[PDB]
RNA sequence: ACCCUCAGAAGGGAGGCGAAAUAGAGCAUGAAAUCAGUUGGCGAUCGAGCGACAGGGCAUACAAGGUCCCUCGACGAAUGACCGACGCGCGAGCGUCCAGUAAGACUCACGGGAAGCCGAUGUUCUGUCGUACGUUUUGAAAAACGAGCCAGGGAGUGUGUCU
RNA sequence: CGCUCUAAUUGGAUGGAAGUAGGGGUGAAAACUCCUAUGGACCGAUUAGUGACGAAAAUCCUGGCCAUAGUAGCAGCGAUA
RNA sequence: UGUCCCAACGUUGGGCCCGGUGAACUGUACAUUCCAGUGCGGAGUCUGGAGACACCCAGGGGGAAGCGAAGACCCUAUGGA
């Protein structure tokens, strides 16, 4: 598992983490990238809109074959990874919760840092023609989130 | 309130005229990197020098641009070869007794990294009193 | 006999692999193979006096 | 759209290649040059074989492309480009600080460069850039 | 342990223990390949053995390197003048004298200056040269063969006899 | 030049050894050395020895890993649910 | 009698976009190429020119003497059956 890769002042900061989540690591880099800098509350509203299909998530690196989306600004390819988005909603729920329990205005805090890290693959095997089997794995993803007072 | 190195830190050795001339030359002429051929093209190939042995090797055949190949002609002047850039001849020291017989006007001392702080303190004060410069001194807040 | 207790055979040309003796899909016996024999090891018959 | 040229050359009755060579030399030396009256520049030889050459350049091509200019404007500008390392920084800079014009958009008159002049009273076998362009099918806008 | 969060004996947060939890369970150390985030340099008009050697930009906590730059002067190898005077050539130009003089790489001294400043390191730009490596071969950049990448593994050894 | 272990002689280490990472110095070079961080217990030098002693390559071996790619497949069969 | 002249329209399943799941082949390096030439005479990488703003989607497969298999042909071996 990871450790926070960035320093954080406990007096004006709140943290949260996801562990070994079996979801697209590629969708996670995309989502992290997109919500960094936003306010928790904005992030949440943004991710609810993605899951609802009203807001696409720019796919700038893992974009092969991805169709263009008119609402993607400054870029072309985008999608709606609702699974990894729900995992981030859990992360944000935990973060904002911690934030509040400490006396902060959770929803109003800025996402100072958010990054996904691939911690491994849950291994699987798939039978194929001609007597062989090939890999059929699940990515395991850790993601860190640091909220910071405005 | 600030850090200061122990010992004769700013000390310089006395060199004959011909030695200062050759020291200055070595420093002006320098030498090529002499890294192994194509070490930059493959991570599994380290920089450590290996004679290019390929029958068709471009560096072996001596093509301009493929880097210089190690030859005796690149050797530094005998009279200065191995001297610290300050001009001192280095003496490896593992304890106080190693300071004995060292000429602080011509040699500087280098305390092995493996030597502890307790013993380094003694070596350092005995070196200064013997007029010997310590190349890798301890910095104390004075 | 270390490294030699195996009937490992090479498949030869055909399956895009180097001609290395294999058993149960594992390379064996030869010196370049992990778990293979020692090419020129210490020998008991050597006169060390 | 205004071109502060340090030099204004008059190509009228001047050998194109000889002017081109000096304009390139000067552009590389950092001069901003404006070649004027390009349509009147001249090129020696049999009009028939000269034109056959430029027509071939017009017919050459394929998907990648071989866009050859037809106006005296570009013919001349291209002639100069072939004398400049236009793909290198210094070469592109020189090339871009040179411009060719149909007629003379300036108030000042250009100067005639030494050695580039052709005496019509002593020559009959020569052609005019304008004549070449018209043959190539250019729209005689000049 | 207790507390908060959560669908939750999960996970997360805060907290407790210990010299150390970046010793919290395949739990000493923790390389490379490589991944996330980020810092420096380059970057959407431009060309490909990825560099070597020179020289510029930008970047640089300390430590382990401390030099570097400009005026002038001294020394001054090979080489080596202008100008001027005189004399030749149809001409481009040349000879003789000035003169082996002025100059001349390195090194040193005086005076002044730099501390991202000199070295060095990262990256990039310019110049010159440059179509990997190993092997096969008369001839390899080769449209001949080998390797996806990294780490570790991986080939003159013993006895007897002879020289 | 470097690696392993043996012996003699002689040193270093919890006032921080080996290793690793980044960085400074030396050597034509093999490679040597220092600084800082990490690490938390072992490590050298000289001399004479010992040898399962040095890798870029063998469609070399084993392990790990990237691009491929969020791609192919998750349709086709007289049983379209 | 749509085999053909000479093709058209339609049906079902794919293809395309979205959620989820999620491989493999292949990879010396670099790589935006084109026309000529050169070169072990069959070059994206050498030379000269030409062209060339970056990225992405769909496509049919011209080229990489494409990938797959240490040529089953031919010869050679004081080889095998
Ligand atoms: Cl992934
Ligand atoms: Cl020598
Ligand atoms: Cl064309
Ligand atoms: Cl060019
Ligand atoms: Cl004429
Ligand atoms: Cl000198
Ligand atoms: Cl041998
Ligand atoms: Mg697609
Ligand atoms: Mg079967
Ligand atoms: Mg390398
Ligand atoms: Mg074994
Ligand atoms: Mg561990
Ligand atoms: Mg080799
Ligand atoms: Mg001894
Ligand atoms: Mg090894
Ligand atoms: Mg594809
Ligand atoms: Mg064969
Ligand atoms: Mg036959
Ligand atoms: Mg037979
Ligand atoms: Na991309
Ligand atoms: Na858009
Ligand atoms: Na848009
Ligand atoms: Na066995
Ligand atoms: Na024996
Ligand atoms: Na002509
Ligand atoms: Na054309
Ligand atoms: Na630089
Ligand atoms: Na070969
Ligand atoms: Na070769
Ligand atoms: Na070839
Ligand atoms: Na592979
Ligand atoms: Na293979
Ligand atoms: Na039909
Ligand atoms: Na094709
Ligand atoms: Sr991409
Ligand atoms: Sr130490
Ligand atoms: Sr065969
Ligand atoms: Sr000229
Ligand atoms: Sr804690
Ligand atoms: Sr002189
Ligand atoms: Sr290896
Ligand atoms: Sr070995
Ligand atoms: Sr993969
Ligand atoms: Sr179905
Ligand atoms: Sr089917
Ligand atoms: Sr070219
Ligand atoms: Sr297709």
Curated annotation (Swiss-Prot), chain A:
<dbReference type="InterPro" id="IPR001063">
    <property type="entry name" value="Ribosomal_uL22"/>
</dbReference>
<dbReference type="InterPro" id="IPR018260">
    <property type="entry name" value="Ribosomal_uL22_CS"/>
</dbReference>
<dbReference type="InterPro" id="IPR036394">
    <property type="entry name" value="Ribosomal_uL22_sf"/>
</dbReference>
<comment type="subunit">
    <text>Part of the 50S ribosomal subunit. Contacts the macrolide antibiotic tylosin in the polypeptide exit tunnel.</text>
</comment>
<dbReference type="InterPro" id="IPR005721">
    <property type="entry name" value="Ribosomal_uL22_euk/arc"/>
</dbReference>
<dbReference type="GO" id="GO:0022625">
    <property type="term" value="C:cytosolic large ribosomal subunit"/>
</dbReference>
<keyword id="KW-0687">Ribonucleoprotein</keyword>
<protein>
    <recommendedName>
        <fullName>Large ribosomal subunit protein uL22</fullName>
    </recommendedName>
</protein>
<comment type="similarity">
    <text>Belongs to the universal ribosomal protein uL22 family.</text>
</comment>
<dbReference type="Pfam" id="PF00237">
    <property type="entry name" value="Ribosomal_L22"/>
</dbReference>
<comment type="function">
    <text>Contacts all 6 domains of the 23S rRNA, helping stabilize their relative orientation. An extended beta-hairpin in the C-terminus forms part of the polypeptide exit tunnel, in which it helps forms a bend with protein L4, while most of the rest of the protein is located at the polypeptide exit tunnel on the outside of the subunit.</text>
</comment>
<dbReference type="GO" id="GO:0002181">
    <property type="term" value="P:cytoplasmic translation"/>
</dbReference>
Curated annotation (Swiss-Prot), chain B:
<dbReference type="GO" id="GO:0003735">
    <property type="term" value="F:structural constituent of ribosome"/>
</dbReference>
<dbReference type="GO" id="GO:0003677">
    <property type="term" value="F:DNA binding"/>
</dbReference>
<feature type="region of interest" description="Disordered">
    <location>
        <begin position="1"/>
        <end position="87"/>
    </location>
</feature>
<keyword id="KW-0699">rRNA-binding</keyword>
<comment type="similarity">
    <text>Belongs to the eukaryotic ribosomal protein eL32 family.</text>
</comment>
<feature type="compositionally biased region" description="Basic residues">
    <location>
        <begin position="38"/>
        <end position="64"/>
    </location>
</feature>
<keyword id="KW-0694">RNA-binding</keyword>
<keyword id="KW-0687">Ribonucleoprotein</keyword>
<keyword id="KW-0689">Ribosomal protein</keyword>
<comment type="subunit">
    <text>Part of the 50S ribosomal subunit. Interacts weakly with protein L15.</text>
</comment>
<dbReference type="GO" id="GO:0022625">
    <property type="term" value="C:cytosolic large ribosomal subunit"/>
</dbReference>
<protein>
    <recommendedName>
        <fullName>Large ribosomal subunit protein eL32</fullName>
    </recommendedName>
</protein>
Swiss-Prot record, chain C:
<comment type="similarity">
    <text>Belongs to the universal ribosomal protein uL4 family.</text>
</comment>
<comment type="function">
    <text>Makes multiple contacts with different domains of the 23S rRNA in the assembled 50S subunit.</text>
</comment>
<protein>
    <recommendedName>
        <fullName>Large ribosomal subunit protein uL4</fullName>
    </recommendedName>
</protein>
<feature type="region of interest" description="Disordered">
    <location>
        <begin position="1"/>
        <end position="49"/>
    </location>
</feature>
<comment type="subunit">
    <text>Part of the 50S ribosomal subunit. Interacts weakly with proteins L18e, L24 and L37e. Has been cross-linked to L18e.</text>
</comment>
<comment type="function">
    <text>One of the primary rRNA binding proteins, this protein initially binds near the 5'-end of the 23S rRNA. It is important during the early stages of 50S assembly.</text>
</comment>
<feature type="compositionally biased region" description="Basic and acidic residues">
    <location>
        <begin position="42"/>
        <end position="49"/>
    </location>
</feature>
Swiss-Prot record, chain D:
<dbReference type="InterPro" id="IPR005822">
    <property type="entry name" value="Ribosomal_uL13"/>
</dbReference>
<comment type="subunit">
    <text>Part of the 50S ribosomal subunit. Interacts weakly with proteins L3 and L6.</text>
</comment>
<dbReference type="GO" id="GO:0019843">
    <property type="term" value="F:rRNA binding"/>
</dbReference>
<keyword id="KW-0694">RNA-binding</keyword>
<dbReference type="InterPro" id="IPR005823">
    <property type="entry name" value="Ribosomal_uL13_bac-type"/>
</dbReference>
<comment type="function">
    <text>This protein is one of the early assembly proteins of the 50S ribosomal subunit. Binds to 23S rRNA.</text>
</comment>
<dbReference type="GO" id="GO:0022625">
    <property type="term" value="C:cytosolic large ribosomal subunit"/>
</dbReference>
<dbReference type="InterPro" id="IPR023563">
    <property type="entry name" value="Ribosomal_uL13_CS"/>
</dbReference>
<keyword id="KW-0689">Ribosomal protein</keyword>
<keyword id="KW-0687">Ribonucleoprotein</keyword>
<comment type="similarity">
    <text>Belongs to the universal ribosomal protein uL13 family.</text>
</comment>
<dbReference type="GO" id="GO:0003729">
    <property type="term" value="F:mRNA binding"/>
</dbReference>
